[PDB]
Amino acid sequence: NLNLPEQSTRFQTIASIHSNNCSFEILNNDPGYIYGDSVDGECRIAVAHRELGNGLERTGDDRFLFIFYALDNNNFIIANRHDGFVLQFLIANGQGVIVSREYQPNIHQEFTIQSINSDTFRLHSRDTNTFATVCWAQFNSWTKIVSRVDNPGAPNANLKHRSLLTDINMPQLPSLTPLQPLPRLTELEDGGLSPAQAPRAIIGRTLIPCLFVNDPVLRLENRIKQSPYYVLEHRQYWHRIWTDIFTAGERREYREVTGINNNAQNDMNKMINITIGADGPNRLRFGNLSTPFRQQIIDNSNTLGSFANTNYGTRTDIVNVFNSEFHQVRYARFVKAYEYRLTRADGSQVGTPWVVLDRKEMDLRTYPHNMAITLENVKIDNADNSYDLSIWKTPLKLKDGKIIIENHENSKPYYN
Amino acid sequence: NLNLPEQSTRFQTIASIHSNNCSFEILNNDPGYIYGDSVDGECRIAVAHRELGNGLERTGDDRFLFIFYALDNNNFIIANRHDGFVLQFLIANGQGVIVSREYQPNIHQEFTIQSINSDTFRLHSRDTNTFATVCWAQFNSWTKIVSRVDNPGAPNANLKHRSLLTDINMPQLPSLTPLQPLPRLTELEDGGLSPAQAPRAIIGRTLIPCLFVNDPVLRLENRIKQSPYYVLEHRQYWHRIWTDIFTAGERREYREVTGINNNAQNDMNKMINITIGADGPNRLRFGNLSTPFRQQIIDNSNTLGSFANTNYGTRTDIVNVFNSEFHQVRYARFVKAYEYRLTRADGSQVGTPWVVLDRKEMDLRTYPHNMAITLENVKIDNADNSYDLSIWKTPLKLKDGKIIIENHENSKPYYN
């Protein structure tokens, strides 16, 4: 069940309703370019880099085909299938024109659709209160696309879509699945599931526009053709940090590394312009490129906005555990992991998933069943930042099958 | 399936971390009010209507309890439980202060949370680059709440929550259910299900902040306490427009009124500041009050943004039908209805639901089974607007159990 307007899930040409067979066409022209067919004056000479032309539409020429990426504010970024550059309003030599530029973004790249009726719309630049149309109403001529204030006698700005391309390599979204608790251990030799065998739950997934996906193998002109959207998945699994057989009364010390590495956060930032904030494993920080889509990404990924100034980092805890049972016992300790994965429209993975190990949500498995280990003591060995320096109140009994979550009763700051 | 920050699903007090006992308190004071405890100067005399005080926190007093309503842009509107007024930044006599005003909204009512660590945050007004705190750092005294830029001398703006109220009458969201096809008719006397008996599918539902819900019986001071969120449901059902027994070869004429009437759109606009746009029965237009929450409302209600300048209206079609069977036949004709319903936290309905009858999606039931009526002719008698003036291509065979949806092949403009 997908909540996008039909303009966001296909490519379409744009034309004046008053033109017999011309449509908006992407050019790589320079200032001083001559539109041969145009009458003399401001409509005959190009005045900016990469103006748009009113060209004879050729079926299946990428230079006429646009996708409308839906922003949270109900405007659109309009990208072309030829090179993935977006439309932009520009004033050059006192003339309002439509050009194509790299996604920045900026307010002049945002367009409003205004529907007049079922098959007629106008393309509004709300900053400047201008509408896109053909220079001096030359609807059947080679000339440029302008954006002008509506006036008695201004050229008619009523547009339509002449052609559609509906086969665009839309991704097939995975189904949502719940996180099941891990199975019980079957004998002393059973270490439980390793991280590579633990089943993944899919908590959320969202489409990501290809425009700000810095895919290491596909340049922009190929992403817009083969993967106009990418898929970001929010998955969870139970991550085993250690397992061992303890003799009766045995004491041991483990180093538990949790959180997410700084290199993984930089990789995620470079790839999609998002990082995990230090306020939680499901809290997203957005840069300039991703911000205009943030509420759609949160709603569909089932994450939340971060309020932190800092990214989630790594922490190393020294834990002392004590087998308070008078039996030989197999213990396996798990924390909840948040796995963020990016795929192309074809299902191929873009890189290694980004993983956050949440130290605040933990489970235990034993053989025999229903045994309990004692957490004697917890010390912080080191932390990348000072955002969350709480530790478990000890002594703490951890029992087979019982999930423990940090709250104000079972934790304290590390110096108390 | 609830994606809100914890600040949006509870009430909390706000306090300086450097105050032993004092929290932000709503006042109904006027300019020239004296803060008895304060040192002389701009901190001793009120300079605006409804300043905030640094008061001794009393547990259970609504004047210290705030809910944070989450905007699409990740700022918040902060409302108090006493009267439902929201916090606002104001300059009075060259002094930056926090006051409480009616939700407007405006940019000075928007606050950013900036987390420093797990239990410490600042309240930022991004327009002005100011942070809320206690006048001249008198953290243990009766005086006003100010908002000042970061400067060497400036009072520490680190805040915390002192108290929580978690029992706030959050609504229970109903489960999503799919639209079933109507049952077959059992005999000639079976007219099928009337609109009041047809089962409703729940396609979407969303929370709506009580601030702009103009509940005809609950004033703002009571809504914030009993129903801090309302529920808007998106339901669909099959709506019977007529049923009759036809003799063999019988012709009849019906007036079919579809759409939604003008009074129903004004009622909806008055109640929640949303109307149905003419571009479709599930397309929402937002006014000034609802716009800041639009993407959350769309995503959770499973509707889409309207691009239309006009609201969905009514249309009256005259249809001529012919029983092309040589049997006596019972016919019942249905169109798809979109039903928008508003309830309080307690489940009580706020008024009559808003219904759009979609003429473009239609079904038929017959007794006996598998009969077909002929649609001879359709003409438009009148329409409120010119947005959709397409009609069915006739003659058209309508068959028992077959849903027909308007497309470019089965419809034409009314003058062809």
Side-chain angles (χ1 to χ4, degrees):
Chain A
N1 190 12
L2 198 61
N3 270 328
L4 290 171
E6 52 173 26
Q7 295 90 347
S8 299
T9 64
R10 75 196 187 183
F11 281 85
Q12 54 246 295
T13 69
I14 304 162
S16 169
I17 69 164
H18 296 280
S19 175
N20 286 318
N21 42 53
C22 296
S23 302
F24 292 14
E25 179 184 7
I26 293 295
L27 304 174
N28 201 356
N29 64 333
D30 300 317
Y33 174 79
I34 302 304
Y35 303 87
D37 287 346
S38 169
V39 293
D40 284 88
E42 56 187 279
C43 298
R44 174 172 186 75
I45 315 189
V47 94
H49 177 69
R50 302 177 60 100
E51 286 190 357
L52 261 77
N54 186 56
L56 240 57
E57 184 171 297
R58 312 178 284 282
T59 331
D61 185 334
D62 292 320
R63 315 183 85 119
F64 300 86
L65 290 171
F66 299 97
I67 186 160
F68 291 50
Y69 290 114
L71 306 177
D72 293 349
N73 61 17
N74 215 46
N75 300 330
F76 293 94
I77 305 295
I78 302 167
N80 81 82
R81 199 160 183 282
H82 174 72
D83 61 19
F85 282 31
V86 310
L87 266 34
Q88 189 178 305
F89 174 87
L90 187 74
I91 311 183
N93 284 75
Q95 191 190 27
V97 290
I98 307 301
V99 299
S100 66
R101 296 290 180 273
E102 212 177 311
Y103 179 72
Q104 189 173 21
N106 65 58
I107 193 177
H108 295 116
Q109 298 185 334
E110 301 187 12
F111 295 84
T112 309
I113 302 166
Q114 163 178 150
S115 297
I116 302 304
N117 62 36
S118 336
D119 47 46
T120 311
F121 64 96
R122 299 164 95 213
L123 218 48
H124 188 220
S125 303
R126 91 230 146 117
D127 185 61
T128 47
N129 199 24
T130 56
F131 300 89
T133 189
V134 184
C135 203
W136 288 17
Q138 299 169 287
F139 298 120
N140 288 319
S141 308
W142 186 236
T143 187
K144 70 177 75 184
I145 307 311
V146 303
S147 185
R148 86 298 173 278
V149 284
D150 75 29
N151 257 70
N156 193 288
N158 291 350
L159 311 172
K160 66 166 184 189
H161 297 128
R162 191 184 291 292
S163 299
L164 301 186
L165 184 70
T166 62
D167 205 335
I168 64 159
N169 304 290
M170 281 295 308
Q172 300 202 324
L173 295 182
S175 293
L176 301 191
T177 58
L179 187 59
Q180 291 157 323
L182 287 162
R184 304 179 84 54
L185 305 184
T186 58
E187 58 180 327
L188 275 174
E189 289 306 324
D190 189 359
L193 299 183
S194 69
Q197 312 160 304
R200 267 67 161 164
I202 302 146
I203 308 300
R205 28 43 169 186
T206 185
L207 300 175
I208 303 287
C210 74
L211 297 182
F212 58 87
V213 178
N214 190 26
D215 183 329
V217 321
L218 296 185
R219 303 299 147 258
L220 176 59
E221 60 270 24
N222 291 317
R223 303 197 282 277
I224 194 75
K225 295 174 181 54
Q226 280 134 20
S227 190
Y229 292 98
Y230 287 63
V231 179
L232 179 64
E233 290 171 72
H234 170 191
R235 307 136 59 91
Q236 292 171 23
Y237 72 93
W238 292 108
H239 187 101
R240 194 184 63 200
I241 38 179
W242 54 257
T243 181
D244 272 310
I245 302 166
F246 284 62
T247 61
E250 188 179 359
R251 296 173 59 206
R252 288 201 194 213
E253 177 163 301
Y254 295 92
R255 301 173 61 91
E256 302 181 350
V257 179
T258 56
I260 181 167
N261 201 281
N262 185 45
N263 293 314
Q265 289 269 49
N266 294 175
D267 182 71
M268 187 177 196
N269 188 38
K270 185 160 124 74
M271 199 61 24
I272 61 174
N273 198 233
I274 300 174
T275 64
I276 312 299
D279 42 353
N282 61 340
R283 317 289 298 245
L284 263 41
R285 294 181 70 203
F286 292 86
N288 292 1
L289 310 172
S290 62
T291 280
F293 303 91
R294 61 181 292 153
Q295 190 67 57
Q296 285 170 84
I297 293 168
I298 280 163
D299 288 345
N300 289 309
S301 75
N302 294 316
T303 54
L304 292 172
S306 184
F307 312 136
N309 42 357
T310 315
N311 293 327
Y312 215 124
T314 280
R315 191 173 127 167
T316 302
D317 289 320
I318 311 304
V319 312
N320 290 89
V321 288
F322 173 59
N323 182 24
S324 35
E325 311 282 8
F326 50 90
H327 305 115
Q328 195 167 15
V329 176
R330 157 71 67 181
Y331 292 104
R333 175 163 153 82
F334 305 85
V335 296
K336 182 173 270 183
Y338 294 70
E339 186 177 63
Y340 298 98
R341 184 189 182 243
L342 191 68
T343 59
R344 306 186 175 87
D346 75 347
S348 56
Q349 201 170 286
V350 177
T352 52
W354 302 296
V355 177
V356 194
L357 306 185
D358 190 4
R359 73 168 191 89
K360 295 183 170 192
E361 179 166 12
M362 52 199 199
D363 203 356
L364 189 76
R365 288 291 181 280
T366 71
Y367 194 93
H369 295 155
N370 305 130
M371 299 289 109
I373 201 171
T374 305
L375 189 54
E376 299 188 53
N377 206 71
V378 187
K379 234 210 321 303
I380 304 179
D381 180 78
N382 71 92
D384 292 336
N385 69 55
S386 60
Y387 190 91
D388 219 326
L389 293 181
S390 64
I391 53 166
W392 301 115
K393 260 217 188 52
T394 53
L396 195 54
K397 217 97 164 179
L398 311 171
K399 184 145 28 170
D400 184 34
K402 289 333 152 79
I403 298 174
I404 298 181
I405 297 172
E406 194 190 80
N407 59 44
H408 302 350
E409 310 309 286
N410 60 18
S411 65
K412 62 188 211 294
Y414 72 90
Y415 45 83
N416 289 344
Chain B
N1 55 35
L2 212 70
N3 257 321
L4 289 171
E6 60 183 20
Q7 293 90 344
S8 303
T9 60
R10 74 193 186 186
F11 282 84
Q12 54 246 297
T13 72
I14 302 161
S16 172
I17 71 162
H18 299 285
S19 176
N20 284 168
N21 282 134
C22 299
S23 301
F24 292 16
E25 179 183 9
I26 293 296
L27 305 173
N28 205 299
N29 64 343
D30 303 299
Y33 174 81
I34 307 153
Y35 302 94
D37 286 354
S38 168
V39 298
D40 217 35
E42 54 165 358
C43 299
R44 176 169 186 74
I45 317 275
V47 92
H49 182 69
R50 298 179 61 105
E51 285 189 354
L52 263 72
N54 188 54
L56 199 32
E57 183 169 299
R58 313 177 284 278
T59 44
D61 188 336
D62 293 321
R63 316 181 83 119
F64 301 88
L65 287 170
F66 297 96
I67 186 161
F68 291 51
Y69 289 115
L71 304 177
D72 292 351
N73 64 13
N74 213 45
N75 299 330
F76 294 94
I77 273 98
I78 304 168
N80 83 82
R81 200 163 182 274
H82 176 74
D83 61 20
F85 282 26
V86 310
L87 300 194
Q88 188 179 306
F89 174 87
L90 190 74
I91 307 186
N93 281 260
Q95 191 188 26
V97 289
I98 306 301
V99 299
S100 67
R101 297 286 181 269
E102 207 179 322
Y103 176 77
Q104 189 177 12
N106 62 58
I107 192 174
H108 296 118
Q109 299 183 335
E110 292 190 20
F111 292 86
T112 309
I113 302 168
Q114 165 186 144
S115 296
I116 306 306
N117 67 35
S118 329
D119 46 33
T120 309
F121 64 95
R122 302 160 91 212
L123 278 178
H124 192 218
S125 307
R126 90 221 132 112
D127 187 60
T128 49
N129 200 24
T130 57
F131 301 90
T133 190
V134 183
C135 203
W136 287 18
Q138 302 174 96
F139 300 119
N140 286 321
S141 309
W142 190 231
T143 188
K144 74 177 72 182
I145 306 311
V146 304
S147 183
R148 85 298 172 280
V149 307
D150 282 339
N151 258 301
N156 190 284
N158 293 356
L159 307 178
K160 69 174 193 188
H161 298 304
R162 192 185 290 292
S163 293
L164 303 181
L165 181 70
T166 68
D167 197 347
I168 63 160
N169 306 290
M170 281 298 294
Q172 292 172 39
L173 298 179
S175 291
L176 305 187
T177 59
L179 185 62
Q180 313 281 64
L182 290 158
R184 318 200 93 195
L185 306 183
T186 61
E187 61 187 335
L188 230 35
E189 302 76 45
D190 186 2
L193 298 185
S194 73
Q197 308 165 305
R200 266 71 163 164
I202 297 151
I203 308 298
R205 66 288 194 266
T206 184
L207 299 176
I208 305 286
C210 75
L211 300 180
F212 60 86
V213 180
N214 193 23
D215 188 323
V217 321
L218 293 188
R219 293 310 147 251
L220 177 59
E221 53 279 8
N222 288 317
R223 301 196 287 272
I224 191 75
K225 294 175 180 51
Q226 280 154 236
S227 190
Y229 292 97
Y230 285 65
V231 184
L232 182 65
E233 293 172 68
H234 170 198
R235 305 139 59 91
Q236 293 168 200
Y237 76 91
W238 291 107
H239 185 105
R240 195 186 62 202
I241 40 180
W242 54 255
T243 180
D244 274 311
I245 300 166
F246 282 64
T247 60
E250 195 172 358
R251 294 175 57 210
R252 288 200 198 213
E253 179 164 300
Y254 293 94
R255 300 177 63 89
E256 301 190 349
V257 179
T258 57
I260 181 170
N261 111 333
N262 197 240
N263 291 327
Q265 291 270 47
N266 292 329
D267 180 74
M268 189 178 197
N269 189 37
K270 190 143 113 79
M271 193 70 64
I272 61 174
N273 194 239
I274 300 173
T275 64
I276 314 295
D279 45 348
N282 58 346
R283 316 288 299 242
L284 262 42
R285 300 185 67 207
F286 293 86
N288 287 150
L289 310 170
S290 59
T291 282
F293 303 93
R294 62 174 301 136
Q295 192 63 54
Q296 294 171 78
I297 291 168
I298 277 162
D299 286 345
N300 289 306
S301 70
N302 296 312
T303 57
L304 291 165
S306 180
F307 314 131
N309 264 338
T310 80
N311 296 325
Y312 213 128
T314 71
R315 186 174 129 171
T316 309
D317 287 71
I318 307 308
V319 315
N320 287 90
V321 288
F322 173 57
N323 183 24
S324 31
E325 310 281 7
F326 50 90
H327 312 113
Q328 191 185 33
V329 177
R330 157 70 69 181
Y331 295 102
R333 178 162 151 79
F334 304 86
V335 294
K336 182 178 264 189
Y338 292 70
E339 185 178 63
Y340 300 97
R341 183 193 182 238
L342 190 72
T343 59
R344 306 182 176 94
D346 73 350
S348 56
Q349 194 175 289
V350 177
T352 57
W354 304 291
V355 175
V356 194
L357 301 188
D358 192 358
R359 74 166 194 90
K360 294 178 168 195
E361 185 168 1
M362 50 198 202
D363 204 354
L364 188 77
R365 288 290 179 280
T366 72
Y367 197 93
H369 295 344
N370 302 127
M371 302 285 111
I373 199 170
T374 307
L375 191 60
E376 297 187 41
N377 201 265
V378 181
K379 73 153 140 163
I380 308 180
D381 173 79
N382 72 96
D384 292 334
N385 68 55
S386 62
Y387 190 99
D388 171 31
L389 293 182
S390 60
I391 53 165
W392 300 110
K393 265 190 228 187
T394 55
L396 193 56
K397 216 91 160 204
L398 310 170
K399 191 169 151 83
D400 183 33
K402 189 150 64 178
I403 302 176
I404 299 179
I405 298 185
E406 191 187 80
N407 59 46
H408 302 312
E409 311 309 288
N410 58 21
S411 66
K412 63 196 213 281
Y414 72 91
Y415 46 85
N416 288 343

